[PDB]
Design an enzyme around this catalytic site. Structure first.
Site, PDB file in Angstrom:
ATOM      1  N   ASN A 190       0.832  -1.202   0.000  1.00  0.00           N
ATOM      2  CA  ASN A 190       0.000   0.000   0.000  1.00  0.00           C
ATOM      3  C   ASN A 190       0.868   1.255   0.000  1.00  0.00           C
ATOM      4  OD1 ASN A 190      -1.770   2.109   0.444  1.00  0.00           O
ATOM      5  ND2 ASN A 190      -2.760   1.232   2.256  1.00  0.00           N
ATOM      6  N   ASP A 228      -1.370   2.586  -4.349  1.00  0.00           N
ATOM      7  CA  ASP A 228      -1.880   1.455  -3.588  1.00  0.00           C
ATOM      8  C   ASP A 228      -2.548   0.437  -4.515  1.00  0.00           C
ATOM      9  OD1 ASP A 228      -2.982  -0.320  -1.776  1.00  0.00           O
ATOM     10  OD2 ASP A 228      -4.533   1.071  -1.103  1.00  0.00           O
ATOM     11  N   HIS A 238      -9.454   1.751 -10.515  1.00  0.00           N
ATOM     12  CA  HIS A 238      -8.177   1.229 -10.985  1.00  0.00           C
ATOM     13  C   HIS A 238      -8.396   0.358 -12.213  1.00  0.00           C
ATOM     14  CE1 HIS A 238      -4.785   2.219  -8.371  1.00  0.00           C
ATOM     15  NE2 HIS A 238      -5.649   2.286  -7.374  1.00  0.00           N
ATOM     16  N   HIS A 291      -4.600   5.896 -10.090  1.00  0.00           N
ATOM     17  CA  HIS A 291      -4.082   7.266  -9.976  1.00  0.00           C
ATOM     18  C   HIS A 291      -3.055   7.495 -11.093  1.00  0.00           C
ATOM     19  CE1 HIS A 291      -5.926   7.558  -6.001  1.00  0.00           C
ATOM     20  NE2 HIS A 291      -5.319   6.434  -5.666  1.00  0.00           N
ATOM     21  N   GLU A 342       2.644   9.378  -7.682  1.00  0.00           N
ATOM     22  CA  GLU A 342       2.355   9.087  -6.276  1.00  0.00           C
ATOM     23  C   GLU A 342       3.617   8.694  -5.507  1.00  0.00           C
ATOM     24  OE1 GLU A 342      -1.098   6.767  -5.051  1.00  0.00           O
ATOM     25  OE2 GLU A 342      -0.316   6.724  -3.007  1.00  0.00           O
ATOM     26  N   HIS A 402       3.665   8.241  -1.963  1.00  0.00           N
ATOM     27  CA  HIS A 402       3.089   8.036  -0.631  1.00  0.00           C
ATOM     28  C   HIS A 402       4.125   7.608   0.411  1.00  0.00           C
ATOM     29  CE1 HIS A 402      -1.017   6.898   1.379  1.00  0.00           C
ATOM     30  NE2 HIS A 402      -0.245   7.606   2.182  1.00  0.00           N
ATOM     31  N   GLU A 456      -1.420  11.567  -3.244  1.00  0.00           N
ATOM     32  CA  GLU A 456      -0.624  11.280  -2.053  1.00  0.00           C
ATOM     33  C   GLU A 456       0.878  11.470  -2.287  1.00  0.00           C
ATOM     34  OE1 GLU A 456      -2.686   7.326  -1.309  1.00  0.00           O
ATOM     35  OE2 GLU A 456      -3.361   8.379   0.505  1.00  0.00           O
ATOM     36  N   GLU A 501     -11.816  10.899  -2.588  1.00  0.00           N
ATOM     37  CA  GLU A 501     -12.031   9.551  -2.054  1.00  0.00           C
ATOM     38  C   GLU A 501     -12.896   9.612  -0.791  1.00  0.00           C
ATOM     39  OE1 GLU A 501      -8.230   7.460  -1.510  1.00  0.00           O
ATOM     40  OE2 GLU A 501      -7.445   8.463  -3.294  1.00  0.00           O
ATOM     41  N   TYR A 502     -13.922   8.765  -0.728  1.00  0.00           N
ATOM     42  CA  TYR A 502     -14.757   8.633   0.476  1.00  0.00           C
ATOM     43  C   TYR A 502     -15.460   7.276   0.487  1.00  0.00           C
ATOM     44  CZ  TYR A 502     -19.374   9.423  -1.808  1.00  0.00           C
ATOM     45  OH  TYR A 502     -20.538   9.304  -2.555  1.00  0.00           O
ATOM     46  N   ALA A 503     -16.021   6.901   1.636  1.00  0.00           N
ATOM     47  CA  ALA A 503     -16.755   5.637   1.789  1.00  0.00           C
ATOM     48  C   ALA A 503     -15.929   4.419   1.344  1.00  0.00           C
ATOM     49  CB  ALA A 503     -18.109   5.693   1.062  1.00  0.00           C
ATOM     50  N   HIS A 504     -14.838   4.178   2.066  1.00  0.00           N
ATOM     51  CA  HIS A 504     -13.919   3.063   1.793  1.00  0.00           C
ATOM     52  C   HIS A 504     -14.674   1.720   1.851  1.00  0.00           C
ATOM     53  CE1 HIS A 504     -10.062   0.753   2.296  1.00  0.00           C
ATOM     54  NE2 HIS A 504      -9.640   1.708   1.488  1.00  0.00           N
ATOM     55  N   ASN A 517       3.774  -7.146   2.798  1.00  0.00           N
ATOM     56  CA  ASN A 517       2.536  -6.972   2.046  1.00  0.00           C
ATOM     57  C   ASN A 517       1.452  -6.349   2.914  1.00  0.00           C
ATOM     58  OD1 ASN A 517       0.449  -9.155   3.020  1.00  0.00           O
ATOM     59  ND2 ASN A 517       2.453 -10.175   2.960  1.00  0.00           N
ATOM     60  N   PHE A 565      -6.041  -5.358   1.980  1.00  0.00           N
ATOM     61  CA  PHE A 565      -6.252  -3.935   1.682  1.00  0.00           C
ATOM     62  C   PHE A 565      -6.315  -3.602   0.189  1.00  0.00           C
ATOM     63  CE2 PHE A 565      -5.640  -2.883   6.185  1.00  0.00           C
ATOM     64  CZ  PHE A 565      -6.532  -1.819   6.331  1.00  0.00           C
ATOM     65  N   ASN A 592     -11.099  -3.190  -2.035  1.00  0.00           N
ATOM     66  CA  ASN A 592     -11.935  -2.108  -1.498  1.00  0.00           C
ATOM     67  C   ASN A 592     -13.119  -1.797  -2.401  1.00  0.00           C
ATOM     68  OD1 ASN A 592      -8.819  -0.422  -1.494  1.00  0.00           O
ATOM     69  ND2 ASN A 592      -9.527  -1.749   0.177  1.00  0.00           N
ATOM     70  N   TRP A 651      -9.184   2.271   8.660  1.00  0.00           N
ATOM     71  CA  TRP A 651      -7.936   2.263   9.442  1.00  0.00           C
ATOM     72  C   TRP A 651      -8.044   2.984  10.789  1.00  0.00           C
ATOM     73  CZ3 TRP A 651      -8.634   3.590   4.399  1.00  0.00           C
ATOM     74  CH2 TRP A 651      -8.654   4.961   4.070  1.00  0.00           C
TER      75      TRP A 651
HETATM   76  C1  IPT Z   1      -4.279   3.119   5.458  1.00  0.00           C
HETATM   77  C2  IPT Z   1      -4.053   4.632   5.402  1.00  0.00           C
HETATM   78  C3  IPT Z   1      -2.913   5.038   6.330  1.00  0.00           C
HETATM   79  S1  IPT Z   1      -3.691   5.175   3.752  1.00  0.00           S
HETATM   80  C4  IPT Z   1      -5.107   4.860   2.743  1.00  0.00           C
HETATM   81  O1  IPT Z   1      -5.036   3.494   2.341  1.00  0.00           O
HETATM   82  C5  IPT Z   1      -6.200   3.068   1.640  1.00  0.00           C
HETATM   83  C6  IPT Z   1      -6.154   1.544   1.595  1.00  0.00           C
HETATM   84  O2  IPT Z   1      -7.110   1.015   0.667  1.00  0.00           O
HETATM   85  C7  IPT Z   1      -6.232   3.792   0.287  1.00  0.00           C
HETATM   86  O3  IPT Z   1      -5.089   3.442  -0.507  1.00  0.00           O
HETATM   87  C8  IPT Z   1      -6.236   5.310   0.516  1.00  0.00           C
HETATM   88  O4  IPT Z   1      -6.078   5.991  -0.740  1.00  0.00           O
HETATM   89  C9  IPT Z   1      -5.154   5.762   1.504  1.00  0.00           C
HETATM   90  O5  IPT Z   1      -5.431   7.098   1.927  1.00  0.00           O
HETATM   91 MG    MG Z   2      -1.442   5.696  -1.607  1.00  0.00          MG
HETATM   92 NA    NA Z   3      -6.475  -0.336  -1.174  1.00  0.00          NA
END
Ligand code: IPT
Ligand code: MG
Ligand code: NA
Ligand code: IPT
Ligand code: MG
Ligand code: MG
Ligand code: NA
Ligand code: NA
Ligand code: NA
Ligand code: NA
Lengths: 1015, 211, 174
Positions: A94, A193, A349, A383, A408, A410, A453, A529-532, A589, A593, A596, A991
């Site tokens: 990620n 990610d 993606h 992205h 990116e 991150h 990011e 990004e919202y509603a994971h 790994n 995650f 999603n 998270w």
């Molecule tokens: C886990 C957070 C510290 S980062 C968080 O991880 C997600 C995992 O699906 C996505 O990649 C989001 O874009 C990211 O902000």
């Molecule tokens: Mg990222």
């Molecule tokens: Na993810």
């Protein structure tokens, strides 16, 4: 020089001998072919069977390979990711880079893919003109050879790299050699990610252009105040020898009708003291009453750009689809064609479970149809720039697109370490500039994004301004560094909550409602990004949509995300199963995650998809007496393919129904008067359901498609009639170990040591495999777990709070178990305490009343210690001996629904096969709950009350112990969980705890009642 | 950018300095051909960024310049904003593309006249007094170059200074220029003489325009 | 690699192995010396007499020059413009480029100045720390070798180019 220069460890070198970027070319030599978008003889695909050899490092590639094919190499399909062919492992990480953070250096062990092709080139292509090769996607860097001679080098995995092969080719047979490096200095800007893969994963092609050629063209559409008049402006650039006889004609077509045409010689207006562009021309065409493009009605024209002589001899034609639309931000609102957008978006993606990151037309079309069918109107290219066909399909089907640069970082510390470093400005600049150069003519692209990011650095500010200078037609957004920096036209936070502030130092995520009104702030807010939607998620989705509709400057967001990034693996028997992070030996790994999505990798919907569809509806409803008020949220179209079906039912029994065509202007209202409904024959609750149906098929949906729905309670007649008094009386039998109750062929057994119903008999067949016991826990959801791991505990996560409190290991201790014989019943009274290391967590007090009618009424009163973490559920469970085919219930459905994700569900009588009552989340968890249930039927059993339930062949224990759905085994009988109360699932993110206070079980005292009988 | 000691001396003696990036593409047709080209952005960025990184602690430097006579291209806007982001303490100026573009904080024309308009298409040189009050215009005006002191020159110099003193937003300018670019050559007797364009067999040349 | 890459005809390569730019440094090891702006033992001038030979092109430069002084070279003062020493003509043009306008290419006849210096380095600099060379102005581009080994490349005539020599230097003569 190649192995000696090590260009893949130099951010100052991102290409060698690469041609300039440009919009999609086909070099038609017939104008009618250009107009119709038919195939071009000048554009050949090199896709198909290639030769491939894998090496551990570039130093290990033999020189013989440049001139001669390696016999040990295999024949593989291209485009492909070589991880999908098994040559090495895909890595799922990620945030943390999949390589050591040591910029610009990569590991000495650098997997190297050696691709080669032997192919024909016709003589006509080499006699005159220019032959170029186009690699649409190579991950992550590559050198190119043609007939043994070195051509060039390219980086950026997500944009086309083009090279002139004119001087390298011969007539007949030619050989290409491509050395593809998995890791490069480019990888430092590619920390998205997602699965980390490599190879030639997008199309390869040959393009023939004349020497005198269209080298670039930009299309702009500007409008008067009411959009009744437009000017199409087309700037065209040429390469080759400038000549007085040269002309460009730009013609605009609506179908087979030409609407406007302009012709001019080359020579732009004066620009500065040295003159103008002699090699450029701008054409301006007037269009009266243009048909406007939007996601609602994707009206398109065809622009044909002809390069020709004054006398009319065509040299070549290029073309594009044109959507007349204006995108602007005014007074803090994002407007399309003068109207404020509400973005029903999703991040997507490029992912296929079998082919990895290779995209095909069929999968792209499948995604678009599903998106629109579920009320999405917008997509973010998370992205990186997408496969070029994606934009074509968004132009034609109608989706708003955020086009995002492949940047990116991150995993850097801090996140802006590279993006604030002027040394990385050149690499960054090319990822932004070459995206804009490629995609600027697509109407579907409405917003540019600077990446993802990568913190906020000065390089972002420079590139923000570059885009604003080159393309004023589209807003620029970027979330990095706190989502409201000087590098973004739109406040675009990720996972900012509706009402709750999260005031992180330096980069707070304010409540979205609060963020809009911060002193000095005026910009629109659209969540990038919202509603994971990770596993059992999207709890609280309705809260977002309520805020979006109430607040003008809250203009929506993009759900994270569209499709699970699971990959197919095969077991010992050759049976396919869905894999996530770590399942390929990849380490470190980030496990599940990568999943999603609103849909599984094979595009089967998760239950969450229907909640999104319902909340993103384009029609809103109010009821008042007999009157339904329908309000349109369409900005441009009338409801000319919509009819309203209405239905009234008494506890699931149809009473009356009808249809009324919808005739609502955009943003307008229609009143529909329901006929006087005859009063119900009996007791119960009347429910009104309405559905918007599309009678006609569209490009994106079938006839009879349901686009919107809503439900209301109408009149309720409470049952006041007493059940007929039976003449039979249940008989209590007592032993030291049991209270037993008998009535006809029915028998109940209460174990006096445990204090639970341990068995029930019908005739003399056992009904239970496990006693009926209280349950206060659930197999933890992905949201319950968060980032918590066995080796690295997050004490804040719900699962760890329950574990530390002893919820999962607390054992029932019996306090009381008594039996009394009554007039027409036997009454069993029990009390239990659940304790952990001297601390009483829960107390359960119950009565079971078995009367002469055979009904067992269960009354449950639970106390929860105020200082214990609020429990996941308050209910009962048991394993029934019966396995039955169907599950029949009166309650919310038909799909899985939870307290904070039940708005899409409707109250009615539902009947499904048992298998539908289980949701096959790839990471197993509590699943398949249905809420608001008043009656449940399973084989001979009926439960009545007001409860939530799930029912399946998998125990909560097995679900929580098993990490992959394919390893689950059907247990003996059926596990039933009947809850009086169940905690929210959350999902604002995955998270940190995200279940809202109103959906936590914090009341301290709880009461519910159930009637169990045989029907 | 100058020899590093120049800034030390301007710090200590007291002169305001405009520090200018080593970018001039005067000979291009049109003048912005390179500076509007994204492929030349990396080369250009280094000439701007490495200047700021070197000289940003000198008090004598009060204004940054993006270069000279390179038209106006998108690369200028990108780099304008880079400086504004990295160093808010100094205005950024740049004359190319009409002296009042989006890449300059200061209207900084060269050889704009006091009272007389020169309305060249695309890049007019307005009277400096008139330039200040064009619809929407609010920026200060300081000529990056004026009063071309070539040979017997500086006629009408007083006209500039009268206007500078009368108009608050006319805040002066930089004369072109300080020192004749003549080079010493020696005749048959070994006697020194001042040479200009063409005197070294250099051709094409622009003769005495170096003085 | 040097003649094959032609880095001086590629606007995507403006340097190789060049260190990051920064404000004037002297690496004082005494605070009072830093305060008073007095000379630093850690900052050494290499100005003075150097060896120089002029060539009509980089292709005309002999390989022997990398490791051994060319006997035909002259001893000249550095810093200098080689036109002021008379090796070729200075050119005065105003607007029109002194070369054919054909970006990124330059004339194949490209006057090349080969400079060299033999110098000693203090013993303590070899055991510890970092030794860098700073060229405050080289017009218009250059490659750098130290003790026969290639170090890096630089462009921009008017800003310093700096290179780490720590891994290239030896005890005694360099
Ligand atoms: C886990 C957070 C510290 S980062 C968080 O991880 C997600 C995992 O699906 C996505 O990649 C989001 O874009 C990211 O902000
Ligand atoms: Mg990222
Ligand atoms: Na993810
Ligand atoms: C001759 C003009 C068209 S250009 C003019 O040339 C001058 C000659 O000294 C200066 O170099 C100026 O900066 C320039 O604008
Ligand atoms: Mg590189
Ligand atoms: Mg170069
Ligand atoms: Na809104
Ligand atoms: Na599990
Ligand atoms: Na003044
Ligand atoms: Na001059």
């Amino acid at each position: 020089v190649v192995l000696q220069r090590r260009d893949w460890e130099n951010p100052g070198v991102t290409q060698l001998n690469r041609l300039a970027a440009h919009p999609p070319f086909a070099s038609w030599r017939n104008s009618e072919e250009a107009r119709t978008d038919r195939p071009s003889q000048q554009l050949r695909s090199l896709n198909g069977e290639w030769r491939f050899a894998w090496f551990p490092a570039p130093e290990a590639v033999p020189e013989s390979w440049l001139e001669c094919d390696l016999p040990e190499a295999d024949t593989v399909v291209v485009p492909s990711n070589w991880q999908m062919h098994g040559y090495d492992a895909p890595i799922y990480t990620n945030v943390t880079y999949p390589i050591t953070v040591n910029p610009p250096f990569v590991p000495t062990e650098n997997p190297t893919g050696c691709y080669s092709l032997t192919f024909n080139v016709d003589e006509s292509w080499l006699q005159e003109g220019q032959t170029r090769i186009i690699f649409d996607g190579v991950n992550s860097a590559f050198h190119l050879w043609c007939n043994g001679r070195w051509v060039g080098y390219g980086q950026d995995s997500r944009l086309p790299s083009e090279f002139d092969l004119s001087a390298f080719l011969r007539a007949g047979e030619n050989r290409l050699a491509v050395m593809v490096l998995r890791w490069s200095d480019g990888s430092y800007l590619e920390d998205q990610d997602m699965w980390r893969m490599s190879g030639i994963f997008r199309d390869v092609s040959l393009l023939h252009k004349p020497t005198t050629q269209i080298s670039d063209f930009h299309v702009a559409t500007r409008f008067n105040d009411d959009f009744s008049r437009a000017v199409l402006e087309a700037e065209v650039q040429m390469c080759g020898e400038l000549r007085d006889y040269l002309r460009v004609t730009v013609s605009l077509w609506q179908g087979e009708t030409q609407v406007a045409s302009g012709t001019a010689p080359f020579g732009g207006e004066i620009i500065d003291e040295r003159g103008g562009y002699a090699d450029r021309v701008t054409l301006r065409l007037n269009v009266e009453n243009p048909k406007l493009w939007s996601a609602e009605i994707p009206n398109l024209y065809r622009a044909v750009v002809e390069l020709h002589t004054a006398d009319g001899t065509l040299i070549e034609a290029e073309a594009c689809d044109v959507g007349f639309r204006e995108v602007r931000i005014e007074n803090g609102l994002l407007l399309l064609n003068g109207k404020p957008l509400l973005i029903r978006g999703v991040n997507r993606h490029e992912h296929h479970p079998l082919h990895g990151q290779v995209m095909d037309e069929q999968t792209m079309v499948q995604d678009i149809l599903l998106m629109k069918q579920n009320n999405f109107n917008a997509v973010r290219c998370s992205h990186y720039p997408n496969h070029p066909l994606w934009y074509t399909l968004c132009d034609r089907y109608g989706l708003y697109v955020v086009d995002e640069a492949n940047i990116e970082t991150h995993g850097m510390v801090p996140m802006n370490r590279l993006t604030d470093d002027p040394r990385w400005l050149p690499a960054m600049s090319e990822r932004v500039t070459r995206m804009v150069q490629r995609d600027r003519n697509h109407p579907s692209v409405i917003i540019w994004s600077l990446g993802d990011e990568s913190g906020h650095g000065a390089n972002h500010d420079a590139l923000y301004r570059w885009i604003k200078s080159v393309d004023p037609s589209r807003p620029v957004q970027y979330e990095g560094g706190g989502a409201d920096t000087t590098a973004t036209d739109i406040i675009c936070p990720m996972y900012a909550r509706v009402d709750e502030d999260q005031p992180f130092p330096a980069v707070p995520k304010w409540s979205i409602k609060k963020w809009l009104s911060l002193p000095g702030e005026t910009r629109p807010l659209i969540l990038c990004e919202y509603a994971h939607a990770m596993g059992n998620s999207l709890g609280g989705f309705a809260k977002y949509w309520q805020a979006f509709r109430q607040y003008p400057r809250l203009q929506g967001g993009f759900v994270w995300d569209w499709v699970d990034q699971s990959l197919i693996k095969y077991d010992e028997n050759g049976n396919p199963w869905s894999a996530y992070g770590g399942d390929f030996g990849d380490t470190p790994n980030d496990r599940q995650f990568c999943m999603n999505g609103l849909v599984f990798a094979d595009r089967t919907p998760h239950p969450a998809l229907t909640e999104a569809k319902h909340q993103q509806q384009f029609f809103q409803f109010r009821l008042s007496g007999q009157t339904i008020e329908v309000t349109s949220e369409y900005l441009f179209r009338h409801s000319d393919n919509e009819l309203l079906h209405w239905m009234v039912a008494l506890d699931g029994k149809p009473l009356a129904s009808g249809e009324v065509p919808l005739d609502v202007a955009p943003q307008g209202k229609q009143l529909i008067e329901l006929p006087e409904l005859p009063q119900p024959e009996s007791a119960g609750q009347l429910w009104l359901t309405v559905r918007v149906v599309q009678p006609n098929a569209t490009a994106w949906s079938e006839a009879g498609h349901i686009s919107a729905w809503q439900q209301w309670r109408l009149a309720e007649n409470l049952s006041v009639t007493l059940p007929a008094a039976s003449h039979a009386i249940p008989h209590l039998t007592t032993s030291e170990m049991d209270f037993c109750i008998e009535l006809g062929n029915k028998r109940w057994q209460f174990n006096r040591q445990s204090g639970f119903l341990s068995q029930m008999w019908i005739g003399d067949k056992k009904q239970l495999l496990t006693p009926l016991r209280d349950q206060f826990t659930r197999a933890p959801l992905d949201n319950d777990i968060g980032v918590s791991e066995a080796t690295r505990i997050d004490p804040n996560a719900w699962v760890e709070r329950w574990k530390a409190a002893g919820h999962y290991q607390a054992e029932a201790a019996l306090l009381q178990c008594t039996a009394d014989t009554l007039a027409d019943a036997v009454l069993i009274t029990t009390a239990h305490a659940w304790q952990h290391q001297g601390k009483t967590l829960f107390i359960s007090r119950k009565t079971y009343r078995i009367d002469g009618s055979g009904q067992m009424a269960i009354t449950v009163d639970v106390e929860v210690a105020s200082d214990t973490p609020h429990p996941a559920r308050i209910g009962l469970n048991c394993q029934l001996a019966q396995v039955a085919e169907r599950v029949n219930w009166l309650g919310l459905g038909p799909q899985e629904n939870y307290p904070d994700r039940l708005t899409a569900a409707c109250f009615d009588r539902w009947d499904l096969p048992l298998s539908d009552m289980y949701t096959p989340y790839v990471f197993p968890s509590e699943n398949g709950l249905r809420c608001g249930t008043r009656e449940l039927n399973y084989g001979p059993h009926q439960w009545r009350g007001d409860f939530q339930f799930n029912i399946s062949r998998y125990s909560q224990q097995q679900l929580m112990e098993t990490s992959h759905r394919h390893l689950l085994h059907a247990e003996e009988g059926t596990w039933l969980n009947i809850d009086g109360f169940h905690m929210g699932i959350g999902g604002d993110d995955s998270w940190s705890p995200s279940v809202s206070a109103e959906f936590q079980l914090s009341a301290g005292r709880y009461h519910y009642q159930l009637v169990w009988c045989q029907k």
